[PDB]
Amino acid sequence: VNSFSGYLKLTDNVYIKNADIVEEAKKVKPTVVVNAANVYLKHGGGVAGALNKATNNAMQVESDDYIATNGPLKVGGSCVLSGHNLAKHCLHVVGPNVNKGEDIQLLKSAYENFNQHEVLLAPLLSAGIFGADPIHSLRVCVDTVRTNVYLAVFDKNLYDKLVSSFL
Ligand SMILES: O=C(O)[C@]1(F)CN(c2ncnc3[nH]c4cc(F)ccc4c23)C[C@H]1C1CC1
């Protein structure tokens, strides 16, 4: 039993809710919140900009030190950093950005990072400003992630399309 509330169950291990991931994280304080990161951990907009703003820019300060030490992530890769006031940990995962011409097949590799964590609160990778089809992203999620994932979808219209079209 866990503290996630109001989710629709899609499969044995995947759950979905129309929610603001920032508000959901502040209420649940999950062990892991997933950020929709880029390789530079520059959290300017989308999910990343919202999560960072909610940390009063502490996420960005920590991220800049991480990059200065380690260099950029790989597309499809991840790193674990602090969850600040939102979660114990933040798993920064880089899905391909279609608006940068990155290979959509890397979306599966991105979701494989979730399997290193028993339970996660997450957005749909590569959705939103990353330019992928969220229906495709949900399919890859369900077919790749084996651990327990609670997906927060900000847009109510999109949440209903995702549910209604789910096979
Ligand atoms: O970055 C994008 O465009 C997204 F679509 C946004 N979306 C979200 N998902 C769940 N909660 C969200 N709260 C927010 C608050 C904001 F001010 C802006 C975006 C969100 C948001 C996932 C993200 C996709 C991986 C690309």
Curated annotation (Swiss-Prot):
<feature type="domain" description="Macro 1">
    <location>
        <begin position="1"/>
        <end position="167"/>
    </location>
</feature>
<protein>
    <recommendedName>
        <fullName>Papain-like protease nsp3</fullName>
    </recommendedName>
</protein>
<comment type="function">
    <text>Responsible for the cleavages located at the N-terminus of the replicase polyprotein. Participates together with nsp4 in the assembly of virally-induced cytoplasmic double-membrane vesicles necessary for viral replication. Antagonizes innate immune induction of type I interferon by blocking the phosphorylation, dimerization and subsequent nuclear translocation of host IRF3. Also prevents host NF-kappa-B signaling. In addition, PL-PRO possesses a deubiquitinating/deISGylating activity and processes both 'Lys-48'- and 'Lys-63'-linked polyubiquitin chains from cellular substrates.</text>
</comment>
<comment type="subunit">
    <text>May form homohexamers. Interacts with N protein.</text>
</comment>
